[PDB]
Amino acid sequence: PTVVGRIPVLDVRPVVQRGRRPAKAVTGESFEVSATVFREGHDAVGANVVLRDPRGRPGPWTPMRELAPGTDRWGATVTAGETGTWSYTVEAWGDPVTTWRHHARIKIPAGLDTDLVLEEGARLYERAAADVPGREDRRELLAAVDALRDESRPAASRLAAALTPQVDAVLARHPLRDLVTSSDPLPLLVERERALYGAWYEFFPRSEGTPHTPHGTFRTAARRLPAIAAMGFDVVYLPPIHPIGTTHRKGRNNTLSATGDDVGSPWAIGSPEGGHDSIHPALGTLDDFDHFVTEAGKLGLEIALDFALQCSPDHPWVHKHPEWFHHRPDGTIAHAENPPKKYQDIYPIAFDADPDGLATETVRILRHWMDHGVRIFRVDNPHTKPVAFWERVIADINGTDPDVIFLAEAFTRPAMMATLAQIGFQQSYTYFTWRNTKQELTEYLTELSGEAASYMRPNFFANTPDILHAYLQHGGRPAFEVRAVLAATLSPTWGIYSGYELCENTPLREGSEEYLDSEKYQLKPRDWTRAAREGTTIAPLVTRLNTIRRENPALRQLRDLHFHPTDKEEVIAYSKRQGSNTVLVVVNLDPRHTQEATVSLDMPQLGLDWHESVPVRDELTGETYHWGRANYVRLEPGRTPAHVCTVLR
Amino acid sequence: PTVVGRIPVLDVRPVVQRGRRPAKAVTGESFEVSATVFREGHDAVGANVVLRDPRGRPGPWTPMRELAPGTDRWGATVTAGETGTWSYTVEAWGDPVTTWRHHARIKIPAGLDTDLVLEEGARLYERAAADVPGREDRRELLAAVDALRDESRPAASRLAAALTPQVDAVLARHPLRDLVTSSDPLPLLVERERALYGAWYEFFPRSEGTPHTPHGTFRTAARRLPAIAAMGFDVVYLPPIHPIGTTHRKGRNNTLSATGDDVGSPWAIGSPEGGHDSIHPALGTLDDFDHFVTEAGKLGLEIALDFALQCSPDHPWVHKHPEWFHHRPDGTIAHAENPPKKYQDIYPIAFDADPDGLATETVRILRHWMDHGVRIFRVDNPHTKPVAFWERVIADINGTDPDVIFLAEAFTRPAMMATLAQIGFQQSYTYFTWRNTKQELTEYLTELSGEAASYMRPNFFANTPDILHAYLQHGGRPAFEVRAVLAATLSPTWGIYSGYELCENTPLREGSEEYLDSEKYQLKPRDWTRAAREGTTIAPLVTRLNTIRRENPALRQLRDLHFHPTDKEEVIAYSKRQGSNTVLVVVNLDPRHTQEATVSLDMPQLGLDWHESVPVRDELTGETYHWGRANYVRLEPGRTPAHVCTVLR
Ligand SMILES: OCC1=C[C@H](NC2CCCCC2)[C@H](O)[C@@H](O)[C@@H]1O[C@H]1O[C@H](CO)[C@@H](O)[C@H](O)[C@H]1O
Numbered sequence A, B: 001p002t003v004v005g006r007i008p009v010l011d012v013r014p015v016v017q018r019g020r021r022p023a024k025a026v027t028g029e030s031f032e033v034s035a036t037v038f039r040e041g042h043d044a045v046g047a048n049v050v051l052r053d054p055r056g057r058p059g060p061w062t063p064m065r066e067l068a069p070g071t072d073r074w075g076a077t078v079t080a081g082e083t084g085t086w087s088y089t090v091e092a093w094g095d096p097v098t099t100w101r102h103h104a105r106i107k108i109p110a111g112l113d114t115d116l117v118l119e120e121g122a123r124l125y126e127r128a129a130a131d132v133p134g135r136e137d138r139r140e141l142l143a144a145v146d147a148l149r150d151e152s153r154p155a156a157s158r159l160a161a162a163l164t165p166q167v168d169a170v171l172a173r174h175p176l177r178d179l180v181t182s183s184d185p186l187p188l189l190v191e192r193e194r195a196l197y198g199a200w201y202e203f204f205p206r207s208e209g210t211p212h213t214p215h216g217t218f219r220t221a222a223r224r225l226p227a228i229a230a231m232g233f234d235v236v237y238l239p240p241i242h243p244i245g246t247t248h249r250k251g252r253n254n255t256l257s258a259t260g261d262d263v264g265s266p267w268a269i270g271s272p273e274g275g276h277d278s279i280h281p282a283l284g285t286l287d288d289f290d291h292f293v294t295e296a297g298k299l300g301l302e303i304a305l306d307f308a309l310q311c312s313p314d315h316p317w318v319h320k321h322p323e324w325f326h327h328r329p330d331g332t333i334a335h336a337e338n339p340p341k342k343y344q345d346i347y348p349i350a351f352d353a354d355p356d357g358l359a360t361e362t363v364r365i366l367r368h369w370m371d372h373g374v375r376i377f378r379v380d381n382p383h384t385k386p387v388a389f390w391e392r393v394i395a396d397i398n399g400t401d402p403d404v405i406f407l408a409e410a411f412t413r414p415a416m417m418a419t420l421a422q423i424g425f426q427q428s429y430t431y432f433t434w435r436n437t438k439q440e441l442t443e444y445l446t447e448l449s450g451e452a453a454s455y456m457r458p459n460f461f462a463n464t465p466d467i468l469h470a471y472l473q474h475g476g477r478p479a480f481e482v483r484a485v486l487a488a489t490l491s492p493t494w495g496i497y498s499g500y501e502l503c504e505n506t507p508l509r510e511g512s513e514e515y516l517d518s519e520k521y522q523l524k525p526r527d528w529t530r531a532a533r534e535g536t537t538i539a540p541l542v543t544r545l546n547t548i549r550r551e552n553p554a555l556r557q558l559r560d561l562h563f564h565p566t567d568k569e570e571v572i573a574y575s576k577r578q579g580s581n582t583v584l585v586v587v588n589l590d591p592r593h594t595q596e597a598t599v600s601l602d603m604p605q606l607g608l609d610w611h612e613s614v615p616v617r618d619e620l621t622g623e624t625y626h627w628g629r630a631n632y633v634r635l636e637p638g639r640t641p642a643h644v645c646t647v648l649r
């Protein structure tokens, strides 16, 4: 009972944890299944991929190719349909027609065994014909058999008849496969399209108030949705919406002690008004939330709620479930840290005393918001909770509600970010904000779209309430334009935190990535109407970007991405492809200086011969350009951060 | 039911084919088990490796360490004992005592929480004490517990009582390990030391004959073993010893037609005189072979036989089992090709008609030679036979006879060479002869001793009857010296084909790696006594080298090897280590010109601080040197090919 089969087929990829977790995909996504495939001896091998939908039904005949000469690594692109748990195997086989055609091309002109090789071809094409099921397809192959056997023509002319394209036609359709060896099935989990594709917008409802009631409510915040929908966003992510604690409530600018009307951080969940299942009374009631969810739905927006498995000291849990916390010998509970950060206003959950209780409550809490229309959750700081916990929770929820998307806010070491993705988290935050040079971007994106894409889906938020990167601080408005072009086109999921559009870039101090007067500790009213009137918002750019994404399926996927070399360190270029769609992007990473460069396009990667012209259209400007293997660009920051181009038919 | 445990343990290496084949080791070999290990939060993890012998008995406590900061990858070295099938797991755990000690060294001198931090520690040393089952070991920790709680003692003095190395002992002896998580078991296959370590010598018995009987016999050939054993070799590899066919026998110098007395290629196995189970009658009988095998053993030599699963057209199988061959439509059998080489004198075995019959006969044949003292098989050209065939045959033979070593002569693409190693082959031939620059050699060895060492064991033959590399052709005798030093110290198994020591370097043509007047097609008599008197043999160095290998256990293992930088491209340097033994080698790869260089030793890789003296002894010359972080060397070809140095304490 051997491990290797008749024709070796080994290390079928994508693979997640040696096959005990599923590789990931979404409806309509293309990705490449691969395998090492070879045989003993010198004869030709073939391989093909077999996708099985959740019912056992196999997909189209999908043959593979050697991906680089002499490597014995084979690949083919396959595509997922209906959501569910799929499986895939690679089949390898002896390819006798390629083997024979290769030998007949040398032996027949050399006059070697011409009578034997031609009868070899007759007998074999007859065998190829026994499985071809069309009357015409059969009779075509069987005529070549007779032409191979016709002794009254020269051998060179008898062989020629087995290589006409009409024979390759019937043979590409129904190949003759010897010694068919299968790999063991590997699991694939296909999820709804939002799991991979979508633009996210984060805002605080409480900041969208009125002059006479400055603390916003769901009813006042619902009026902010049309602006957000108009920018072309699909998901609206809310910070925690529940009662905020008062004990150790932080004041403005992350000061330890609040004052009389300081609002405190929404992540300080819990007070005697309720916990994670309740609405913060200054926002309104549970019906105000439904109104919000409904108004959001009407505009085409999906609500994502923040799940922060933590408490403020006034959460009812603190006394209702003391065992969900770790108490020091004097009974105090150390405030949470994500060092060097200090979170004095909140308690971390301890998990080893009553793990069943936390699991049951977490899914109850989540099923509560699920009942009110929340189908997406931004999971706050998951890496400070056990990995097997999220694995169990995501399984429970998805077993009944497979459409529920979880997003992991895990800024941490590479191991944990990877593991959290592989145990269930549909999407992941990334290092995107700390990748700002051409080389950082190229490296990270080469990895995220490389092997990582079989378990991670990246969500490129260009800012968060916790991350005002120095690139944006020092670059001003042209910085905000470049990072949006970058995020919206390098990832099929990107996002911004409200105020990005207004280029809010004042840090708490220098060397800090915190916002001065951070929205986390204060209402942050914003004059959206003034900013729009005065053109001091890049909301026009954000909108056209999400428009380009919605008209171009190359931008709705992640794995098909290639960087093109340019002769300036500040100018990056790359293209993505989906079928006939080819988007091509050139960004100037200099926020401060005009750059000109030669972008030397890797023409075959766009599907073109080395010398062809390319009709492209700069979808930001609408202008059309004719490009070739080398193209002169000039990008003036402020005027034009980048060309975002589709190729034209 | 989750995939990930409480404290994650992930991607445990070494692994072969996702765990479906065993990792390899030999009795007494050391190698590193590694794992990705981490936890949620900021407290410390510990991990240890649990190796199990074939009765299940667990090995010593083997704790692991993070291999680089922030990588969450941990490792520990394990050592194999008795032959058999072992297994190994990694356990990870919360390390609460390490976390507390960290907090206690910071908080206690600052005077922060001293009474709480000291009580946290007492309660926890109390917990380590519930697991120590000895009244004294308990009271040891409990005295630290009582001193940690002694409020009549200075805080710095209570803390000291929990950090005495007298307490560090009883804790490294009985660690407090929380939430212990295990990986699933991985299999380890431990083989006798000769599978990894040993020197091979290949020669043709028929070449060692009398002037009246030029075709040698086992009885005359047995007389050549004293020279071989005295040269320090362990294994004697004989080409096929069976009847040679006459149909299409090749003549001298690989000519297609023989003459009246041309001896033919020994690989043309088979005639009505017998096949693979019979002895070529010009060699003597099966009793002469017994005499030869017995006489070889008395000298400390093991016999390795060539197994070539193929036939001359006169083999009895050609008519007894036509189904073991591939027939053209007229019933003839195409002669074997390994293009562009043509082997007109032999037919390849075909495997798809009677695979059980071929298997049964193959293990029948091998058990015959096993019965006559042959416990090693050099499998000729295995990559022209199905991979699963070798898997099932090697499993079968080793199932009854686990000591039988198979060596695979597969010069081919890396996929096949890897798989044959992973399916059973104890040793592999390598690319060694085609790696002659400093960069080629370093790249190859970094690969062979890196991850490849978990499944392949290299046999560094510096020449074969089929490979006289141009390096040896053009370099002459100093080239032959360099490659022997290189082979004998880079791999724990190396070998030479007889005539190497006489520096036979005359090729078939320019551009060939074939031997002129190949022993494969003609008796090749050699005046061994004359060559030694005339000093035209490098047998002294071969003998010196094999002695150095036998006194220096660093040269009897593969995985611990480190390259040291030198400022001349032609001078390579490296060291290997096994326990206290450190061998350090500096070779001049220039065969024609004296090279001088500064060898800049990577002192930590030798186990020294950058300022230490290193007393070495050049095992080739007996000279003694005092070396340091940087060393000037001068190597003259002919006089000194290399320093091979042992360190002195
Ligand atoms: O939930 C805790 C936390 C961390 C998350 N992720 C960070 C961590 C590391 C890298 C940057 C992102 C969340 O997104 C972030 O909103 C949150 O912090 C905010 O809420 C806390 C509770 O009231 C305050 O104590 C704190 O001062 C304030 O900043």
Ligand SMILES: OCC1=C[C@H](NC2CCCCC2)[C@H](O)[C@@H](O)[C@@H]1O[C@H]1O[C@H](CO)[C@@H](O)[C@H](O)[C@H]1O
Pocket (backbone or CB within 6 Å): B250, B254, B265, B266, B267, B268, B308, B338, B342, B343, B344, B345, B346, B380, B381, B409, B411, B464, B465, B466, B467, B520
């Ligand atoms: O057995 C097959 C073969 C090849 C092996 N592998 C080579 C391949 C090329 C690269 C270097 C190694 C082995 O060395 C070698 O035992 C063998 O050759 C010999 O066997 C044939 C049968 O009699 C003769 O026709 C031929 O003339 C003679 O030379």
